[PDB]
Amino acid sequence: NENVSGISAYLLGLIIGDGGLYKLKYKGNRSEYRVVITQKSENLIKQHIAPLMQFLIDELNVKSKIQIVKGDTRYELRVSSKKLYYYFANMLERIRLFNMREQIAFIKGLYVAEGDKTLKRLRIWNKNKALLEIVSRWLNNLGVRNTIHLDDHRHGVYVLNISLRDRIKFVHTILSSHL
DNA sequence: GCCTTGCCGGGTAAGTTCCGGCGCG
DNA sequence: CGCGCCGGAACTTACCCGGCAAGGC
Ligand SMILES: [Ca+2]
């Protein structure tokens, strides 16, 4: 709807990237379901990310608050919502069936989260190789050549390197898409 | 000459799961 | 009683950064 689907895919890229989906068990039988995006800067969160999450929450009739919690090392945007937790967890599941619009939005969010930011090089870091392999195939379909290697042998972190030969296509189509 | 990109260590910006409390049928 | 939101934060490490050099054209 597809204001919503595009924004959803983008937020998921931020959540998977910078972020998390948590199902918590307490005593008892208490529980909590969290959608989380963390980020160093309060401004990026408050003026860019939160209004996107708020739009989605309103559109989904989710009754939960957007919480912004200050940590010692970063800010946390958090929505405590069973319904939103499952919306994103099922979407993730999910992810191979994304259309072109959701593909581009997801990759954009994932790059904002896990991205080389100078743009001198175009690189995405993640330990989830299968996720990078999905993104690699999508990028190939969009004709951005790319390679995946184990970058950090210490922590098992993969890099997806976007070929600078296809830099203009990647930055124009994905990273500065008006979609 | 100039660009690209694999490699690889530094260290902080992420991530994850605890806690005490309250809401609501 | 049985679960699900709220607000916080303690703790560990997964990212990003960025320099070096092999390799391609
Ligand atoms: Ca990030």
Short mmCIF file of all heavy atoms in Angstrom, two decimals, chain B residues 1 3 7-8 11-12 16-20 23-25, chain C residues 1-3 6-10 14-15 18-19 23 25:
data_model
loop_
_atom_site.label_atom_id
_atom_site.label_comp_id
_atom_site.label_asym_id
_atom_site.label_seq_id
_atom_site.Cartn_x
_atom_site.Cartn_y
_atom_site.Cartn_z
"O5'" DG B 1 52.44 9.52 -14.77
"C5'" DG B 1 51.99 8.22 -14.51
"C4'" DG B 1 50.49 8.32 -14.48
"O4'" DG B 1 49.88 7.04 -14.76
"C3'" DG B 1 49.90 8.81 -13.16
"O3'" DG B 1 48.83 9.72 -13.49
"C2'" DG B 1 49.49 7.50 -12.47
"C1'" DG B 1 49.15 6.58 -13.64
N9 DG B 1 49.51 5.17 -13.54
C8 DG B 1 50.63 4.61 -12.95
N7 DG B 1 50.67 3.31 -13.06
C5 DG B 1 49.53 2.97 -13.79
C6 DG B 1 49.04 1.72 -14.23
O6 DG B 1 49.52 0.59 -14.07
N1 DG B 1 47.84 1.84 -14.93
C2 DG B 1 47.20 3.04 -15.18
N2 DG B 1 46.06 2.98 -15.88
N3 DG B 1 47.65 4.21 -14.78
C4 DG B 1 48.82 4.11 -14.09
P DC B 3 42.08 8.39 -10.25
OP1 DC B 3 40.97 9.26 -10.72
OP2 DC B 3 42.82 8.72 -9.00
"O5'" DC B 3 41.52 6.89 -10.18
"C5'" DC B 3 40.95 6.30 -11.36
"C4'" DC B 3 40.61 4.84 -11.14
"O4'" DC B 3 41.82 4.05 -10.99
"C3'" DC B 3 39.75 4.58 -9.91
"O3'" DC B 3 38.56 3.94 -10.37
"C2'" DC B 3 40.60 3.68 -9.02
"C1'" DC B 3 41.63 3.08 -9.98
N1 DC B 3 42.97 2.77 -9.37
C2 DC B 3 43.48 1.46 -9.41
O2 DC B 3 42.84 0.55 -9.95
N3 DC B 3 44.70 1.21 -8.85
C4 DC B 3 45.38 2.20 -8.27
N4 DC B 3 46.57 1.90 -7.74
C5 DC B 3 44.88 3.53 -8.22
C6 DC B 3 43.69 3.78 -8.78
P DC B 7 41.01 -11.82 0.69
OP1 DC B 7 41.75 -13.06 0.32
OP2 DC B 7 39.62 -11.91 1.22
"O5'" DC B 7 41.87 -10.98 1.74
"C5'" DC B 7 43.19 -10.60 1.39
"C4'" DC B 7 43.76 -9.65 2.43
"O4'" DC B 7 43.13 -8.37 2.29
"C3'" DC B 7 43.54 -10.04 3.89
"O3'" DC B 7 44.82 -10.28 4.43
"C2'" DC B 7 42.85 -8.84 4.55
"C1'" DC B 7 43.15 -7.73 3.55
N1 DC B 7 42.22 -6.54 3.44
C2 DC B 7 42.72 -5.28 3.80
O2 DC B 7 43.88 -5.19 4.22
N3 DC B 7 41.91 -4.19 3.69
C4 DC B 7 40.67 -4.31 3.25
N4 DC B 7 39.95 -3.18 3.17
C5 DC B 7 40.12 -5.59 2.88
C6 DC B 7 40.93 -6.67 2.98
P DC B 8 45.04 -11.13 5.78
OP1 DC B 8 46.44 -11.61 5.71
OP2 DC B 8 43.92 -12.09 5.96
"O5'" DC B 8 44.87 -10.02 6.93
"C5'" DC B 8 45.85 -9.01 7.16
"C4'" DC B 8 45.36 -7.96 8.16
"O4'" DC B 8 44.45 -7.04 7.50
"C3'" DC B 8 44.62 -8.50 9.38
"O3'" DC B 8 45.14 -7.94 10.60
"C2'" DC B 8 43.18 -8.05 9.16
"C1'" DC B 8 43.42 -6.73 8.42
N1 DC B 8 42.20 -6.19 7.75
C2 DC B 8 42.03 -4.79 7.63
O2 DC B 8 42.90 -4.01 8.06
N3 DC B 8 40.91 -4.33 7.03
C4 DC B 8 39.96 -5.15 6.58
N4 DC B 8 38.87 -4.60 6.01
C5 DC B 8 40.10 -6.57 6.68
C6 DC B 8 41.22 -7.04 7.27
P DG B 11 42.85 1.91 19.37
OP1 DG B 11 43.43 3.28 19.46
OP2 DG B 11 43.23 0.85 20.33
"O5'" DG B 11 41.26 2.02 19.43
"C5'" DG B 11 40.54 3.01 18.69
"C4'" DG B 11 39.06 2.72 18.85
"O4'" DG B 11 38.70 1.53 18.10
"C3'" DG B 11 38.60 2.46 20.28
"O3'" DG B 11 37.32 3.04 20.47
"C2'" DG B 11 38.48 0.94 20.35
"C1'" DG B 11 37.92 0.71 18.95
N9 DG B 11 37.94 -0.65 18.44
C8 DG B 11 38.77 -1.70 18.78
N7 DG B 11 38.49 -2.79 18.11
C5 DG B 11 37.42 -2.43 17.29
C6 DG B 11 36.69 -3.19 16.33
O6 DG B 11 36.87 -4.38 16.02
N1 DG B 11 35.68 -2.44 15.72
C2 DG B 11 35.42 -1.11 15.99
N2 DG B 11 34.42 -0.53 15.33
N3 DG B 11 36.09 -0.39 16.88
C4 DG B 11 37.07 -1.12 17.48
P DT B 12 37.17 4.49 21.11
OP1 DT B 12 38.23 5.37 20.56
OP2 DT B 12 37.00 4.27 22.56
"O5'" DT B 12 35.75 4.99 20.53
"C5'" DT B 12 35.50 5.10 19.12
"C4'" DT B 12 34.12 4.56 18.77
"O4'" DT B 12 34.19 3.12 18.60
"C3'" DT B 12 33.01 4.79 19.80
"O3'" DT B 12 31.73 4.94 19.18
"C2'" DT B 12 33.05 3.49 20.60
"C1'" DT B 12 33.22 2.52 19.43
N1 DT B 12 33.66 1.12 19.73
C2 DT B 12 33.21 0.13 18.87
O2 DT B 12 32.50 0.35 17.92
N3 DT B 12 33.63 -1.14 19.17
C4 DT B 12 34.45 -1.51 20.23
O4 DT B 12 34.77 -2.69 20.40
C5 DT B 12 34.88 -0.43 21.10
C7 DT B 12 35.77 -0.70 22.28
C6 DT B 12 34.48 0.82 20.81
P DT B 16 21.17 -8.48 18.02
OP1 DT B 16 21.75 -9.67 17.35
OP2 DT B 16 19.83 -7.99 17.63
"O5'" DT B 16 21.14 -8.69 19.59
"C5'" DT B 16 22.24 -9.30 20.26
"C4'" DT B 16 21.91 -9.41 21.73
"O4'" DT B 16 21.95 -8.11 22.35
"C3'" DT B 16 20.55 -10.00 22.09
"O3'" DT B 16 20.80 -11.21 22.82
"C2'" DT B 16 19.85 -8.91 22.90
"C1'" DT B 16 21.03 -8.09 23.42
N1 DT B 16 20.83 -6.63 23.71
C2 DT B 16 21.24 -6.15 24.94
O2 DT B 16 21.73 -6.83 25.81
N3 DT B 16 21.04 -4.80 25.13
C4 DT B 16 20.50 -3.90 24.24
O4 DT B 16 20.41 -2.71 24.53
C5 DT B 16 20.09 -4.46 22.97
C7 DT B 16 19.48 -3.56 21.91
C6 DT B 16 20.27 -5.78 22.76
P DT B 17 19.60 -12.16 23.29
OP1 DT B 17 20.08 -13.57 23.30
OP2 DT B 17 18.39 -11.84 22.51
"O5'" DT B 17 19.39 -11.67 24.80
"C5'" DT B 17 20.44 -11.75 25.75
"C4'" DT B 17 20.02 -11.10 27.05
"O4'" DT B 17 19.91 -9.66 26.91
"C3'" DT B 17 18.68 -11.56 27.62
"O3'" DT B 17 18.89 -11.79 28.98
"C2'" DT B 17 17.76 -10.36 27.42
"C1'" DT B 17 18.75 -9.22 27.60
N1 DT B 17 18.37 -7.88 27.03
C2 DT B 17 18.68 -6.73 27.73
O2 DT B 17 19.25 -6.72 28.81
N3 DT B 17 18.31 -5.56 27.12
C4 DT B 17 17.69 -5.41 25.90
O4 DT B 17 17.41 -4.30 25.45
C5 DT B 17 17.39 -6.65 25.21
C7 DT B 17 16.70 -6.66 23.88
C6 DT B 17 17.74 -7.81 25.80
P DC B 18 18.09 -12.89 29.82
OP1 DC B 18 18.58 -14.24 29.46
OP2 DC B 18 16.64 -12.59 29.79
"O5'" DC B 18 18.69 -12.52 31.25
"C5'" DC B 18 17.89 -11.73 32.07
"C4'" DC B 18 18.63 -10.55 32.63
"O4'" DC B 18 18.92 -9.58 31.61
"C3'" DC B 18 17.72 -9.84 33.61
"O3'" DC B 18 17.94 -10.42 34.88
"C2'" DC B 18 18.17 -8.39 33.52
"C1'" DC B 18 18.54 -8.28 32.06
N1 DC B 18 17.48 -7.66 31.16
C2 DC B 18 17.29 -6.26 31.21
O2 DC B 18 17.98 -5.58 31.99
N3 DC B 18 16.35 -5.69 30.41
C4 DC B 18 15.61 -6.45 29.59
N4 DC B 18 14.72 -5.81 28.82
C5 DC B 18 15.77 -7.87 29.51
C6 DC B 18 16.71 -8.42 30.31
P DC B 19 16.75 -10.62 35.93
OP1 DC B 19 17.34 -11.28 37.11
OP2 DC B 19 15.58 -11.24 35.26
"O5'" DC B 19 16.38 -9.11 36.30
"C5'" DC B 19 17.33 -8.29 36.98
"C4'" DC B 19 16.75 -6.91 37.15
"O4'" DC B 19 16.72 -6.21 35.88
"C3'" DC B 19 15.30 -6.93 37.59
"O3'" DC B 19 15.29 -7.11 39.00
"C2'" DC B 19 14.82 -5.55 37.16
"C1'" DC B 19 15.64 -5.28 35.90
N1 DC B 19 14.84 -5.37 34.64
C2 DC B 19 14.21 -4.21 34.16
O2 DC B 19 14.32 -3.14 34.79
N3 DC B 19 13.49 -4.28 33.02
C4 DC B 19 13.39 -5.43 32.36
N4 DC B 19 12.68 -5.44 31.23
C5 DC B 19 14.02 -6.63 32.82
C6 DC B 19 14.73 -6.55 33.96
P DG B 20 13.99 -6.97 39.93
OP1 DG B 20 14.47 -7.06 41.33
OP2 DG B 20 12.94 -7.89 39.42
"O5'" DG B 20 13.49 -5.47 39.64
"C5'" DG B 20 13.94 -4.31 40.35
"C4'" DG B 20 12.89 -3.24 40.15
"O4'" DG B 20 12.64 -3.05 38.73
"C3'" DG B 20 11.54 -3.61 40.78
"O3'" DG B 20 10.97 -2.50 41.47
"C2'" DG B 20 10.68 -4.05 39.59
"C1'" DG B 20 11.26 -3.22 38.45
N9 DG B 20 11.03 -3.85 37.14
C8 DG B 20 11.21 -5.17 36.81
N7 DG B 20 10.92 -5.45 35.57
C5 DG B 20 10.51 -4.23 35.04
C6 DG B 20 10.08 -3.91 33.73
O6 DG B 20 9.96 -4.70 32.78
N1 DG B 20 9.75 -2.55 33.60
C2 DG B 20 9.85 -1.63 34.61
N2 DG B 20 9.50 -0.36 34.35
N3 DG B 20 10.25 -1.92 35.84
C4 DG B 20 10.58 -3.24 35.99
P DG B 23 -1.11 1.60 35.68
OP1 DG B 23 -1.52 2.95 35.23
OP2 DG B 23 -1.67 1.03 36.93
"O5'" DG B 23 -1.41 0.57 34.49
"C5'" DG B 23 -0.73 0.67 33.23
"C4'" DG B 23 -1.58 0.09 32.11
"O4'" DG B 23 -1.23 -1.30 31.87
"C3'" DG B 23 -3.09 0.04 32.35
"O3'" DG B 23 -3.70 0.12 31.07
"C2'" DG B 23 -3.28 -1.31 33.05
"C1'" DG B 23 -2.21 -2.18 32.38
N9 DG B 23 -1.55 -3.19 33.21
C8 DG B 23 -1.08 -3.07 34.50
N7 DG B 23 -0.54 -4.16 34.96
C5 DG B 23 -0.64 -5.07 33.92
C6 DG B 23 -0.24 -6.43 33.83
O6 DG B 23 0.33 -7.14 34.68
N1 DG B 23 -0.55 -6.99 32.59
C2 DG B 23 -1.18 -6.34 31.56
N2 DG B 23 -1.39 -7.05 30.44
N3 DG B 23 -1.57 -5.08 31.63
C4 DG B 23 -1.27 -4.50 32.83
P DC B 24 -5.26 0.44 30.87
OP1 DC B 24 -5.32 1.31 29.67
OP2 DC B 24 -5.87 0.87 32.15
"O5'" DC B 24 -5.95 -0.96 30.55
"C5'" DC B 24 -5.55 -1.80 29.49
"C4'" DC B 24 -6.08 -3.19 29.76
"O4'" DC B 24 -5.13 -3.91 30.58
"C3'" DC B 24 -7.42 -3.25 30.50
"O3'" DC B 24 -8.30 -4.07 29.77
"C2'" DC B 24 -7.07 -3.92 31.82
"C1'" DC B 24 -5.88 -4.78 31.39
N1 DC B 24 -5.10 -5.28 32.55
C2 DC B 24 -4.58 -6.60 32.52
O2 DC B 24 -4.76 -7.32 31.52
N3 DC B 24 -3.89 -7.05 33.61
C4 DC B 24 -3.71 -6.25 34.68
N4 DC B 24 -3.03 -6.73 35.73
C5 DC B 24 -4.24 -4.91 34.72
C6 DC B 24 -4.93 -4.48 33.65
P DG B 25 -9.88 -4.04 29.96
OP1 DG B 25 -10.41 -3.24 28.84
OP2 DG B 25 -10.26 -3.71 31.35
"O5'" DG B 25 -10.28 -5.57 29.74
"C5'" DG B 25 -9.94 -6.29 28.55
"C4'" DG B 25 -10.15 -7.78 28.81
"O4'" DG B 25 -9.12 -8.22 29.72
"C3'" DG B 25 -11.48 -8.18 29.48
"O3'" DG B 25 -11.91 -9.44 28.96
"C2'" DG B 25 -11.15 -8.32 30.95
"C1'" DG B 25 -9.70 -8.79 30.88
N9 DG B 25 -8.86 -8.38 32.00
C8 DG B 25 -8.71 -7.11 32.53
N7 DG B 25 -7.88 -7.06 33.52
C5 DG B 25 -7.44 -8.37 33.66
C6 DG B 25 -6.53 -8.94 34.57
O6 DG B 25 -5.91 -8.37 35.47
N1 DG B 25 -6.36 -10.32 34.37
C2 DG B 25 -6.99 -11.06 33.41
N2 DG B 25 -6.72 -12.37 33.36
N3 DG B 25 -7.85 -10.53 32.55
C4 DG B 25 -8.03 -9.19 32.73
"O5'" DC C 1 -3.94 -15.55 40.67
"C5'" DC C 1 -4.45 -16.79 40.18
"C4'" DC C 1 -4.36 -16.87 38.66
"O4'" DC C 1 -4.87 -15.66 38.06
"C3'" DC C 1 -2.97 -17.10 38.07
"O3'" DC C 1 -3.10 -18.15 37.10
"C2'" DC C 1 -2.58 -15.74 37.47
"C1'" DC C 1 -3.94 -15.13 37.13
N1 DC C 1 -4.08 -13.64 37.26
C2 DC C 1 -4.66 -12.90 36.21
O2 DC C 1 -5.03 -13.47 35.18
N3 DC C 1 -4.81 -11.55 36.37
C4 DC C 1 -4.42 -10.96 37.51
N4 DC C 1 -4.58 -9.64 37.61
C5 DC C 1 -3.84 -11.69 38.59
C6 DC C 1 -3.70 -13.01 38.42
P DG C 2 -1.90 -18.67 36.17
OP1 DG C 2 -2.26 -20.04 35.73
OP2 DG C 2 -0.61 -18.40 36.85
"O5'" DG C 2 -1.98 -17.71 34.89
"C5'" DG C 2 -2.97 -17.89 33.89
"C4'" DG C 2 -2.75 -16.88 32.77
"O4'" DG C 2 -2.97 -15.55 33.29
"C3'" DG C 2 -1.34 -16.89 32.18
"O3'" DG C 2 -1.47 -17.03 30.77
"C2'" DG C 2 -0.75 -15.55 32.61
"C1'" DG C 2 -2.00 -14.68 32.73
N9 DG C 2 -1.86 -13.52 33.61
C8 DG C 2 -1.22 -13.50 34.82
N7 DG C 2 -1.25 -12.34 35.40
C5 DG C 2 -1.96 -11.53 34.53
C6 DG C 2 -2.30 -10.15 34.62
O6 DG C 2 -2.04 -9.35 35.53
N1 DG C 2 -3.03 -9.71 33.52
C2 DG C 2 -3.38 -10.51 32.45
N2 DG C 2 -4.08 -9.92 31.48
N3 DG C 2 -3.06 -11.79 32.35
C4 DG C 2 -2.35 -12.24 33.41
P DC C 3 -0.30 -17.54 29.82
OP1 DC C 3 -0.69 -18.82 29.20
OP2 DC C 3 1.01 -17.44 30.50
"O5'" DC C 3 -0.29 -16.44 28.71
"C5'" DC C 3 0.68 -15.44 28.90
"C4'" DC C 3 0.09 -14.11 28.51
"O4'" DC C 3 -0.28 -13.42 29.72
"C3'" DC C 3 1.12 -13.27 27.77
"O3'" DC C 3 0.61 -12.97 26.48
"C2'" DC C 3 1.31 -12.05 28.65
"C1'" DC C 3 0.12 -12.08 29.59
N1 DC C 3 0.43 -11.51 30.93
C2 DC C 3 0.03 -10.20 31.20
O2 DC C 3 -0.58 -9.56 30.32
N3 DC C 3 0.31 -9.67 32.42
C4 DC C 3 0.98 -10.39 33.33
N4 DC C 3 1.24 -9.81 34.51
C5 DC C 3 1.41 -11.73 33.06
C6 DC C 3 1.11 -12.24 31.87
P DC C 6 3.25 1.43 25.37
OP1 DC C 6 2.14 2.40 25.37
OP2 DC C 6 4.09 1.30 24.17
"O5'" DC C 6 4.24 1.69 26.59
"C5'" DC C 6 3.79 2.08 27.86
"C4'" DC C 6 4.95 2.23 28.84
"O4'" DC C 6 5.43 0.93 29.22
"C3'" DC C 6 6.19 3.04 28.44
"O3'" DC C 6 6.24 4.17 29.32
"C2'" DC C 6 7.37 2.09 28.72
"C1'" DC C 6 6.74 1.10 29.69
N1 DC C 6 7.31 -0.28 29.82
C2 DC C 6 7.95 -0.61 31.02
O2 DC C 6 8.03 0.25 31.90
N3 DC C 6 8.45 -1.86 31.18
C4 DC C 6 8.34 -2.75 30.20
N4 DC C 6 8.87 -3.96 30.40
C5 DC C 6 7.70 -2.43 28.96
C6 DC C 6 7.20 -1.19 28.82
P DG C 7 7.03 5.53 28.99
OP1 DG C 7 6.39 6.62 29.76
OP2 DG C 7 7.16 5.63 27.52
"O5'" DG C 7 8.47 5.25 29.62
"C5'" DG C 7 8.63 5.27 31.02
"C4'" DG C 7 10.03 4.84 31.40
"O4'" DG C 7 10.07 3.39 31.34
"C3'" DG C 7 11.18 5.35 30.52
"O3'" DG C 7 12.10 6.08 31.35
"C2'" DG C 7 11.80 4.07 29.93
"C1'" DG C 7 11.38 3.04 30.98
N9 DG C 7 11.35 1.66 30.53
C8 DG C 7 10.86 1.16 29.35
N7 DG C 7 10.97 -0.14 29.26
C5 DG C 7 11.58 -0.52 30.44
C6 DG C 7 11.95 -1.81 30.91
O6 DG C 7 11.82 -2.90 30.33
N1 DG C 7 12.53 -1.75 32.19
C2 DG C 7 12.73 -0.59 32.92
N2 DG C 7 13.31 -0.73 34.13
N3 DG C 7 12.38 0.62 32.49
C4 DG C 7 11.82 0.58 31.25
P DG C 8 13.51 6.68 30.87
OP1 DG C 8 13.71 7.95 31.60
OP2 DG C 8 13.61 6.68 29.38
"O5'" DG C 8 14.55 5.61 31.42
"C5'" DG C 8 14.38 5.10 32.74
"C4'" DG C 8 15.30 3.92 32.97
"O4'" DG C 8 14.81 2.77 32.27
"C3'" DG C 8 16.72 4.12 32.46
"O3'" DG C 8 17.58 4.21 33.60
"C2'" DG C 8 17.00 2.89 31.60
"C1'" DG C 8 15.91 1.93 32.04
N9 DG C 8 15.54 0.92 31.04
C8 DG C 8 14.90 1.12 29.85
N7 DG C 8 14.72 0.02 29.17
C5 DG C 8 15.27 -0.98 29.96
C6 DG C 8 15.37 -2.38 29.75
O6 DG C 8 14.97 -3.05 28.78
N1 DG C 8 15.99 -3.03 30.81
C2 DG C 8 16.47 -2.39 31.93
N2 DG C 8 17.06 -3.16 32.86
N3 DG C 8 16.39 -1.08 32.15
C4 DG C 8 15.78 -0.44 31.12
P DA C 9 19.02 4.90 33.49
OP1 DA C 9 19.34 5.50 34.81
OP2 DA C 9 19.06 5.72 32.25
"O5'" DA C 9 19.96 3.62 33.31
"C5'" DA C 9 19.81 2.50 34.18
"C4'" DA C 9 20.51 1.28 33.61
"O4'" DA C 9 19.66 0.67 32.60
"C3'" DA C 9 21.87 1.51 32.95
"O3'" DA C 9 22.75 0.49 33.36
"C2'" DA C 9 21.59 1.35 31.47
"C1'" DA C 9 20.51 0.27 31.54
N9 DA C 9 19.79 0.09 30.28
C8 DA C 9 19.35 1.05 29.40
N7 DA C 9 18.77 0.56 28.33
C5 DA C 9 18.85 -0.81 28.53
C6 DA C 9 18.42 -1.91 27.75
N6 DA C 9 17.80 -1.76 26.58
N1 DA C 9 18.65 -3.15 28.23
C2 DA C 9 19.28 -3.30 29.41
N3 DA C 9 19.73 -2.35 30.23
C4 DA C 9 19.48 -1.12 29.72
P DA C 10 24.07 0.82 34.20
OP1 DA C 10 23.66 1.65 35.37
OP2 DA C 10 25.09 1.32 33.25
"O5'" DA C 10 24.50 -0.64 34.72
"C5'" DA C 10 23.53 -1.71 34.86
"C4'" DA C 10 24.02 -3.02 34.24
"O4'" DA C 10 23.41 -3.24 32.94
"C3'" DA C 10 25.52 -3.15 34.02
"O3'" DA C 10 25.91 -4.49 34.32
"C2'" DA C 10 25.70 -2.81 32.54
"C1'" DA C 10 24.40 -3.31 31.92
N9 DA C 10 23.90 -2.55 30.78
C8 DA C 10 23.93 -1.19 30.58
N7 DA C 10 23.39 -0.81 29.44
C5 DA C 10 22.97 -1.99 28.86
C6 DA C 10 22.31 -2.29 27.63
N6 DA C 10 21.95 -1.37 26.74
N1 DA C 10 22.04 -3.58 27.36
C2 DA C 10 22.39 -4.53 28.24
N3 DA C 10 23.00 -4.37 29.41
C4 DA C 10 23.27 -3.07 29.67
P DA C 14 30.09 -10.70 17.48
OP1 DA C 14 29.19 -11.49 18.34
OP2 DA C 14 31.20 -11.37 16.77
"O5'" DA C 14 29.22 -9.91 16.40
"C5'" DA C 14 28.03 -9.18 16.76
"C4'" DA C 14 27.91 -7.89 15.96
"O4'" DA C 14 28.90 -6.92 16.37
"C3'" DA C 14 28.11 -7.99 14.45
"O3'" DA C 14 27.22 -7.04 13.81
"C2'" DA C 14 29.60 -7.65 14.28
"C1'" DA C 14 29.76 -6.55 15.30
N9 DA C 14 31.05 -6.41 15.97
C8 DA C 14 31.96 -7.38 16.27
N7 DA C 14 33.01 -6.93 16.92
C5 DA C 14 32.75 -5.59 17.08
C6 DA C 14 33.47 -4.55 17.69
N6 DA C 14 34.65 -4.73 18.28
N1 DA C 14 32.94 -3.31 17.66
C2 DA C 14 31.76 -3.13 17.06
N3 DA C 14 30.99 -4.04 16.46
C4 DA C 14 31.55 -5.25 16.50
P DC C 15 26.85 -7.21 12.28
OP1 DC C 15 25.68 -6.36 12.02
OP2 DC C 15 26.75 -8.63 11.90
"O5'" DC C 15 28.19 -6.64 11.60
"C5'" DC C 15 28.30 -5.35 10.98
"C4'" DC C 15 28.40 -4.23 12.01
"O4'" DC C 15 29.54 -4.44 12.88
"C3'" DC C 15 28.65 -2.85 11.42
"O3'" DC C 15 28.06 -1.86 12.31
"C2'" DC C 15 30.17 -2.77 11.39
"C1'" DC C 15 30.47 -3.37 12.76
N1 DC C 15 31.84 -3.94 13.01
C2 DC C 15 32.83 -3.21 13.70
O2 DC C 15 32.59 -2.05 14.07
N3 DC C 15 34.03 -3.81 13.94
C4 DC C 15 34.26 -5.07 13.53
N4 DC C 15 35.46 -5.63 13.78
C5 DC C 15 33.27 -5.82 12.82
C6 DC C 15 32.09 -5.23 12.60
P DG C 18 37.78 7.33 8.82
OP1 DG C 18 38.10 8.39 9.81
OP2 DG C 18 37.00 7.66 7.60
"O5'" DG C 18 39.13 6.65 8.34
"C5'" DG C 18 40.13 6.20 9.27
"C4'" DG C 18 41.14 5.32 8.55
"O4'" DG C 18 40.60 3.97 8.39
"C3'" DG C 18 41.53 5.78 7.15
"O3'" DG C 18 42.93 5.65 7.04
"C2'" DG C 18 40.82 4.78 6.23
"C1'" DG C 18 40.94 3.54 7.10
N9 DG C 18 40.15 2.40 6.65
C8 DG C 18 38.97 2.42 5.93
N7 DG C 18 38.49 1.23 5.65
C5 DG C 18 39.43 0.37 6.22
C6 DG C 18 39.47 -1.05 6.24
O6 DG C 18 38.65 -1.82 5.73
N1 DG C 18 40.58 -1.54 6.92
C2 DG C 18 41.56 -0.76 7.51
N2 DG C 18 42.57 -1.41 8.12
N3 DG C 18 41.54 0.57 7.50
C4 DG C 18 40.45 1.06 6.84
P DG C 19 43.86 6.77 6.38
OP1 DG C 19 43.97 7.88 7.35
OP2 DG C 19 43.37 7.02 5.00
"O5'" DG C 19 45.24 5.98 6.30
"C5'" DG C 19 45.74 5.35 7.48
"C4'" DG C 19 46.51 4.09 7.13
"O4'" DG C 19 45.55 3.02 6.92
"C3'" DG C 19 47.36 4.18 5.86
"O3'" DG C 19 48.68 3.65 6.09
"C2'" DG C 19 46.56 3.37 4.84
"C1'" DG C 19 45.85 2.35 5.72
N9 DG C 19 44.60 1.85 5.14
C8 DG C 19 43.54 2.61 4.68
N7 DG C 19 42.56 1.89 4.22
C5 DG C 19 42.98 0.58 4.40
C6 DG C 19 42.32 -0.65 4.08
O6 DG C 19 41.21 -0.80 3.56
N1 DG C 19 43.10 -1.76 4.42
C2 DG C 19 44.35 -1.70 5.00
N2 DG C 19 44.94 -2.88 5.25
N3 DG C 19 44.97 -0.57 5.30
C4 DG C 19 44.23 0.53 4.98
P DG C 23 49.43 -10.29 -7.12
OP1 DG C 23 48.97 -11.69 -6.95
OP2 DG C 23 50.80 -10.01 -7.61
"O5'" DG C 23 48.41 -9.54 -8.08
"C5'" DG C 23 47.02 -9.52 -7.73
"C4'" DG C 23 46.25 -8.61 -8.64
"O4'" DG C 23 46.46 -7.23 -8.24
"C3'" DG C 23 46.66 -8.70 -10.10
"O3'" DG C 23 45.49 -9.04 -10.84
"C2'" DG C 23 47.24 -7.31 -10.42
"C1'" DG C 23 46.50 -6.45 -9.41
N9 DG C 23 47.11 -5.15 -9.08
C8 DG C 23 48.41 -4.90 -8.68
N7 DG C 23 48.65 -3.64 -8.45
C5 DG C 23 47.44 -3.01 -8.69
C6 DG C 23 47.10 -1.64 -8.60
O6 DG C 23 47.82 -0.69 -8.27
N1 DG C 23 45.76 -1.41 -8.94
C2 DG C 23 44.87 -2.39 -9.32
N2 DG C 23 43.63 -1.99 -9.61
N3 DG C 23 45.18 -3.68 -9.41
C4 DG C 23 46.48 -3.92 -9.08
P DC C 25 41.73 -6.65 -17.02
OP1 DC C 25 40.33 -7.10 -17.20
OP2 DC C 25 42.85 -7.49 -17.51
"O5'" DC C 25 41.88 -5.19 -17.67
"C5'" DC C 25 41.10 -4.10 -17.18
"C4'" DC C 25 41.69 -2.77 -17.63
"O4'" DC C 25 42.82 -2.47 -16.78
"C3'" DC C 25 42.21 -2.75 -19.06
"O3'" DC C 25 41.40 -1.87 -19.83
"C2'" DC C 25 43.64 -2.23 -18.96
"C1'" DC C 25 43.72 -1.68 -17.53
N1 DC C 25 45.08 -1.74 -16.88
C2 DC C 25 45.63 -0.57 -16.32
O2 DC C 25 45.01 0.50 -16.39
N3 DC C 25 46.85 -0.65 -15.72
C4 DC C 25 47.51 -1.81 -15.66
N4 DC C 25 48.71 -1.82 -15.06
C5 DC C 25 46.97 -3.00 -16.22
C6 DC C 25 45.76 -2.93 -16.81
#
